[PDB]
Design a protein around this ligand. Sequence first.
Ligand SMILES: [Mg+2]
Ligand SMILES: [Mg+2]
Ligand SMILES: [Mg+2]
Ligand SMILES: [Mg+2]
Ligand SMILES: [Mg+2]
Ligand SMILES: [Mg+2]
Ligand SMILES: [Mg+2]
Ligand SMILES: [Zn+2]
Lengths: 204, 60, 126, 141, 81, 96
Amino acid sequence: GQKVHPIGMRIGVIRDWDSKWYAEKDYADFLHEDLRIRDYVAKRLSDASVSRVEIERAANRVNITIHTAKPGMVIGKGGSEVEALRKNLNELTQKRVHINIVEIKRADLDAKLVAENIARQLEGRVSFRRAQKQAIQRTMRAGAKGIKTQVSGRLGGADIARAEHYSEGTVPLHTLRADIDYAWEEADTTYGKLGVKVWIYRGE
Amino acid sequence: AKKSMIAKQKRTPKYAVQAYTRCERCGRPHSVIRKFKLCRICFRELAYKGQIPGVKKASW
Amino acid sequence: QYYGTGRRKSSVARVRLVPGDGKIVINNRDWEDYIPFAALREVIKQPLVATETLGNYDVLVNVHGGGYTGQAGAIRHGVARALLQVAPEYRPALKSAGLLTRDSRMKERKKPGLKGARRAPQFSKR
Amino acid sequence: VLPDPIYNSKLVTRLINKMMVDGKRGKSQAILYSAFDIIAQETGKDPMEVFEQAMKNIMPLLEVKARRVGGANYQVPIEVRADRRSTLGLRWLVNYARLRGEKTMEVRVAREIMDAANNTGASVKKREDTHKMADANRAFA
Amino acid sequence: RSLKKGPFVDDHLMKKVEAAAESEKKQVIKTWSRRSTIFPTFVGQTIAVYDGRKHVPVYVQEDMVGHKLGEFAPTRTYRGH
Amino acid sequence: KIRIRLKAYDHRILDQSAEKIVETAKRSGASVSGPIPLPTEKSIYTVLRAVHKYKDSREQFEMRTHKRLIDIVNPTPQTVDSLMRLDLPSGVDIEI
RNA sequence: CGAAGAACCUUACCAGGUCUUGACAUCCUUUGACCACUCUGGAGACAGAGCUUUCCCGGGACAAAGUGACAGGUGGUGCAUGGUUGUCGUCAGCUCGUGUCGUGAGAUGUUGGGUUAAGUCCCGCAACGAGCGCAACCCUUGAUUUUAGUUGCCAGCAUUUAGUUGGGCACUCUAAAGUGACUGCCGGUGCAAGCCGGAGGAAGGUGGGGAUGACGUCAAAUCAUCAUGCCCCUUAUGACCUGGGCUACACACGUGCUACAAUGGAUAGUACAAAGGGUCGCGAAGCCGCGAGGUGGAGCUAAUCCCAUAAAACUAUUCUCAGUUCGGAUUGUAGGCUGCAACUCGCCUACAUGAAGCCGGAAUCGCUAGUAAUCGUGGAUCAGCAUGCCACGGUGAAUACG
Ligand SMILES: [Mg+2]
Ligand SMILES: [Mg+2]
Ligand SMILES: [Mg+2]
Ligand SMILES: [Mg+2]
Ligand SMILES: [Mg+2]
Ligand SMILES: [Mg+2]
Ligand SMILES: [Mg+2]
Ligand SMILES: [Zn+2]
């Protein structure tokens, strides 16, 4: 069959939407502003392990919280990275900006991060067995009560495609008391695109 | 086509009746909701992702 | 002034009872000018005849929501409630008559791909 | 179901529900009331008694069922359920009362209940014909 | 226009037709206008109306005033299968 | 004789923000009403689940609003200042 | 069905008229406001002129011309792909670790006896256990407590054309946190799981309805939402403009709306809804107009005000069973809106015309309850354009032997 996006199934249930504001007459403007913002962030901070972005609006200021595993790149030895960010984001938004940077602990408990790991591996021509399995073991060591992954594409350069999925632990997608994380990431290959999907069942 | 069409959307037409809506993400004209300004399919994506405020999945 | 609320479909009757001869007002109108049908008027009576209290009290009603039959059902419901209120020993009679059963039959959803709640299109293989 | 508000019969309410068209219970119920008023006019007696006699006349006992037997399909007779008994009576009543062709519906229905209490009418011809075919095919019981 | 606030006619056609009072009707006027009404002032001067692929001539009359130009220049050529 | 209208998408945030306002408003002036709930005006956007075909299979998205209303009954400049300083958990809208 | 809106635009197609670093981006070099508005030749794109371009503090942001790198392709392949989707099927099934049997493939488990909506649950068994699914956690509806009472309510009260004004949250209504329904209790039977009945209660047996769609099947559909490998065009398979076509018409199918009438139609009066939308948007009252509408501008960023007479129902009068006062097509004339523009090719109104049709061959479809049927309403898309789509309430059945 076809599965529902297990995040979308849980918005307004146990997860809060990431784009947080109220608006009227300003809604589309703020939305597409913040989509441009996420494009900027993903474009210039894919390397930095950026994995979640929550937006906030009040008093015209563009408040942001970037949850990342390595802060030391978003900030760090210079102190000028976040200032560059708010400068260019001022140029876009035509507003004020402020940017908190949160440290994620257990970076292998975020499906987005894990999917980027696997995707960079598969672009570097690593085996799609070892990739999935090592990501799984890293999660279950990092503290996941459940893990699941799959890859679909021209696996290994085939003509015909298929899917390879592997799971440890309890991963119930029909339960909603589940705190599940999910992600989909894309890898490029000289043969074509590979779709990596991940989802994690977490502690409490 | 679609890049030239997305351009021609944004510049002002000869007459104002010639306006028409397009999703800024993917400029498809059909099923674009002027309240969100998104097309239906991009809307479904982002609404799953929780990148749209206040919208969730309608049970009832 | 005894009191009860009564609900049927989307109809809501705030109803009250006083001791009287049998006169009845509904929305500042005659029961006959509001419910002209003998069937629905008898439906209103049903508690007052299940327990012989018709020739004793006046039924004073206000109503919103729904249609005429739904409002009637609400009214009899709130009436039976207020009869309980004035006398819990009417509980057995009115329960066994089924007037305390708040009619939970609400009007069902429409659904996608269906031309109603349950109706689907005309199927054709070819 | 439930008995009629006025008369102490569920048959009236069922007949109302079986004449009803698109929820028009008010129209159906009123015309049946006026039709009993008509038969009381032209007879002067118990509408319940005359309607009961008409029932008892239109009321079948035996009816065919279509059953595969011996490489074909046959009509085997069978004693009808007591509920389907009344159901078929009221059904037939309403359908002949529609296809009759007088002026007004209450009139059609009232004349049919009269004829039925008198052992006349299409509705009784129907019972007789059902008995006739079932009895023709009583070899298969 | 359907309304008393009208009529309508393209300025780029009205101007040429007004200049065509000294035409003497030896010449002919091409227009890509099919939406413009016919005034009586158009009478006599043949107009070559653009149907989609060609300019088709029409001779105006008193009888074809009040109508448009496209009614006399069909779009879809059809021959009874 | 002044009024606050709070409207948002999240009733827990909104209720708690209103309780915050009400406690601070009672501290800065004692006579104030409680918060009163209004109806939840909402919008159900109905979308094709598929891309190309399948008009018959869909997905529905409800954007609700929850909103509360407050009435101040004896203002002071202390109250006005406590509301002029205070910034709320965003995702909401305050109206005075 | 994509299409939750084909007049132009959309629009990708066609004819014509045109451009080639381009309609759209980066990198270089020169320059800096670029442009805007008027005139002329134009179908317009576009050419000629004018008036007039204020860049801001070497930097920043956007801009004209050169200049090649590049661009662009709704050009292809869904038999290379991702992602998204139907489908068997919300069917109850699909598997796995360890163990054991089998040379082995495979089996076992997962069969059996019962039971359940359900590989649900019990007893038994060379299997013991687990995962995905089922169920349940979620939303909504069904009764009720506390909190808060305005933009909602009006009982006890006065008074107004108006719940109006005062006053009060009684009651509704609203919406947060709670309660409750769990075979929890009783009787029968079962060994047991469970099954049947009974009580209380609003609700009794996963209460009702939703969302929620397992491994995988149809190389199912999608390169036209998007991205995307390969190939192809790259002074044209690219780009602009006007006009046309997507609305053709001998004919076939599907899906629906309207009817074929007296449980009805014309005319008048007239009661009771829910769910929704509104800022340059809803648009009141009053007035003009047969009417569609025009005028007007109140109130409203909305439980305040508007869209908004709800219609079926009911009551009266008439038509008297007729191709009819049925039906309402088609056509002619004249109007109104929208929009630069209503011929191709919008909708609506008035008058007239009055078509086919007097209940549908062989066949075939939905539905088990507030359902089917039936009546209106709203929303999206949208300037305008719906019998379509999604939600809303009103009325409200028949039947289930098996
Ligand atoms: Mg348009
Ligand atoms: Mg395929
Ligand atoms: Mg295909
Ligand atoms: Mg479930
Ligand atoms: Mg295929
Ligand atoms: Mg078409
Ligand atoms: Mg059955
Ligand atoms: Zn889009």
